[PDB]
Design a binder for this molecule. Sequence first.
Ligand SMILES: *[C@@H]1O[C@H](CO)[C@@H](O[C@@H]2O[C@H](CO)[C@@H](O)[C@H](O)[C@H]2NC(C)=O)[C@H](O)[C@H]1NC(C)=O
Lengths: 36, 49
Amino acid sequence: CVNLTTRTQLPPAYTNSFTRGVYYPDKVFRSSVLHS
Amino acid sequence: FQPTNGVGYQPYRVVVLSFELLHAPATVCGPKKSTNLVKNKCVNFNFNG
Ligand SMILES: *[C@@H]1O[C@H](CO)[C@@H](O[C@@H]2O[C@H](CO)[C@@H](O)[C@H](O)[C@H]2NC(C)=O)[C@H](O)[C@H]1NC(C)=O
């Protein structure tokens, strides 16, 4: 692993995350229900 | 660990067995006298436990 020396700064930007990031909280199958 | 220590000082082998599942697939079972599958009649099921 060599030290890379071609970076160009450019401070990072930010993005408005949309409706993403929901996994299956538990291991139990369900159907036609609204679970909190 | 003196060879003639009192029983309050002698080596024990304290080991803890911890286990608590919620819905994970089973991988450990006991005597396991599991029988054949049965049909639409009323039966007492044990399946996964
Ligand atoms: C360049 O590579 C070296 C190799 O490890 C990185 O480590 C630095 O140099 C010596 C390693 O022999 C350490 O004593 C220093 O403390 C290290 N510096 C830092 C800031 O960690 C070095 O980090 C690399 N340079 C970078 C990534 O800019």
